[PDB]
mmCIF file of C-alpha atoms in Angstrom:
data_model
loop_
_atom_site.group_PDB
_atom_site.id
_atom_site.type_symbol
_atom_site.label_atom_id
_atom_site.label_comp_id
_atom_site.label_asym_id
_atom_site.label_seq_id
_atom_site.Cartn_x
_atom_site.Cartn_y
_atom_site.Cartn_z
ATOM 1 C CA UNK A 28 -1.270 30.231 63.482
ATOM 2 C CA UNK A 29 0.407 32.525 61.180
ATOM 3 C CA UNK A 30 3.448 31.458 62.452
ATOM 4 C CA UNK A 31 5.554 31.512 59.190
ATOM 5 C CA UNK A 32 5.107 32.454 55.447
ATOM 6 C CA UNK A 33 3.019 31.819 52.631
ATOM 7 C CA UNK A 34 5.794 30.971 50.160
ATOM 8 C CA UNK A 35 6.773 28.204 52.997
ATOM 9 C CA UNK A 36 2.891 26.553 52.021
ATOM 10 C CA UNK A 37 3.012 26.653 48.950
ATOM 11 C CA UNK A 38 6.572 25.410 48.352
ATOM 12 C CA UNK A 39 5.849 22.725 50.933
ATOM 13 C CA UNK A 40 2.803 21.551 49.237
ATOM 14 C CA UNK A 41 4.359 22.239 45.462
ATOM 15 C CA UNK A 42 7.264 19.436 46.864
ATOM 16 C CA UNK A 43 3.888 17.249 47.953
ATOM 17 C CA UNK A 44 2.265 17.198 44.057
ATOM 18 C CA UNK A 45 5.752 17.162 42.453
ATOM 19 C CA UNK A 46 6.466 13.778 44.270
ATOM 20 C CA UNK A 47 3.316 12.101 43.417
ATOM 21 C CA UNK A 48 4.069 12.857 39.756
ATOM 22 C CA UNK A 49 7.642 11.228 40.460
ATOM 23 C CA UNK A 50 6.162 8.367 41.996
ATOM 24 C CA UNK A 51 3.156 8.046 38.632
ATOM 25 C CA UNK A 52 6.182 8.546 36.344
ATOM 26 C CA UNK A 53 7.911 5.084 37.712
ATOM 27 C CA UNK A 54 4.672 3.471 38.443
ATOM 28 C CA UNK A 55 4.007 3.402 34.528
ATOM 29 C CA UNK A 56 7.014 2.475 33.821
ATOM 30 C CA UNK A 57 6.661 -0.918 35.965
ATOM 31 C CA UNK A 58 3.468 -1.125 34.536
ATOM 32 C CA UNK A 59 5.598 -0.270 31.308
ATOM 33 C CA UNK A 60 7.439 -3.059 31.654
ATOM 34 C CA UNK A 61 5.177 -6.132 33.447
ATOM 35 C CA UNK A 62 2.491 -5.667 29.432
ATOM 36 C CA UNK A 63 6.336 -8.034 28.122
ATOM 37 C CA UNK A 64 5.156 -10.904 30.567
ATOM 38 C CA UNK A 65 1.305 -11.035 31.380
ATOM 39 C CA UNK A 66 2.802 -13.379 34.546
ATOM 40 C CA UNK A 67 3.336 -16.488 32.444
ATOM 41 C CA UNK A 68 5.372 -19.358 33.568
ATOM 42 C CA UNK A 69 8.576 -19.271 31.580
ATOM 43 C CA UNK A 70 8.600 -21.987 29.045
ATOM 44 C CA UNK A 71 4.505 -20.409 27.910
ATOM 45 C CA UNK A 72 6.816 -16.783 26.514
ATOM 46 C CA UNK A 73 6.252 -16.276 23.365
ATOM 47 C CA UNK A 74 9.948 -17.090 22.459
ATOM 48 C CA UNK A 75 11.074 -19.708 24.581
ATOM 49 C CA UNK A 76 7.760 -21.044 22.629
ATOM 50 C CA UNK A 77 8.778 -19.702 19.270
ATOM 51 C CA UNK F 10 -23.183 -18.092 -45.156
ATOM 52 C CA UNK F 11 -22.031 -18.447 -41.006
ATOM 53 C CA UNK F 12 -18.606 -19.601 -40.718
ATOM 54 C CA UNK F 13 -16.780 -17.917 -38.116
ATOM 55 C CA UNK F 14 -18.263 -17.308 -34.777
ATOM 56 C CA UNK F 15 -18.598 -13.775 -34.206
ATOM 57 C CA UNK F 16 -20.616 -13.061 -31.078
ATOM 58 C CA UNK F 17 -19.109 -13.014 -27.551
ATOM 59 C CA UNK F 18 -21.297 -13.997 -24.774
ATOM 60 C CA UNK F 19 -21.123 -12.437 -20.532
ATOM 61 C CA UNK F 20 -21.166 -15.596 -19.116
ATOM 62 C CA UNK F 21 -17.691 -18.278 -18.682
ATOM 63 C CA UNK F 22 -17.951 -21.356 -18.893
ATOM 64 C CA UNK F 23 -17.173 -24.128 -16.215
ATOM 65 C CA UNK F 24 -16.725 -21.966 -12.911
ATOM 66 C CA UNK F 25 -16.084 -23.757 -9.655
ATOM 67 C CA UNK F 26 -15.893 -22.364 -6.954
ATOM 68 C CA UNK F 27 -14.544 -25.351 -4.175
ATOM 69 C CA UNK F 28 -11.122 -24.264 -3.042
ATOM 70 C CA UNK F 29 -12.643 -21.323 -1.822
ATOM 71 C CA UNK F 30 -12.175 -20.790 1.670
ATOM 72 C CA UNK F 31 -14.157 -19.096 4.095
ATOM 73 C CA UNK F 32 -11.865 -16.706 6.611
ATOM 74 C CA UNK F 33 -14.399 -16.262 9.478
ATOM 75 C CA UNK F 34 -12.345 -19.659 11.861
ATOM 76 C CA UNK F 35 -9.336 -17.821 11.437
ATOM 77 C CA UNK F 36 -10.020 -14.636 12.294
ATOM 78 C CA UNK F 37 -11.603 -15.248 15.479
ATOM 79 C CA UNK F 38 -8.946 -17.322 16.719
ATOM 80 C CA UNK F 39 -6.951 -14.064 15.876
ATOM 81 C CA UNK F 40 -9.519 -11.662 17.966
ATOM 82 C CA UNK F 41 -9.284 -14.557 20.596
ATOM 83 C CA UNK F 42 -5.423 -14.457 20.471
ATOM 84 C CA UNK F 43 -5.430 -10.203 20.659
ATOM 85 C CA UNK F 44 -7.383 -10.713 23.577
ATOM 86 C CA UNK F 45 -6.136 -12.866 25.832
ATOM 87 C CA UNK F 46 -2.569 -11.069 25.128
ATOM 88 C CA UNK F 47 -4.538 -6.963 25.784
ATOM 89 C CA UNK F 48 -3.458 -7.743 29.528
#
């Protein structure tokens, strides 16, 4: 309805995008950590077997 | 006269090939292991 400045809408939209990107970073970090487990039992992990 | 041998030949004597191993099965095992740990 044109009741706020357009710079306020731009800032809010950019904030949403930035939050999405930060969430992506966190998710990929967690996925990277899970690459070393692969959901196997404790005795099946390579180090314990070695 | 021919007292000392003076000829060469490009063919070996007494070739033995047994005890030479083929590495296919171990390569299959390696592929299987690598595929299991990639997800």
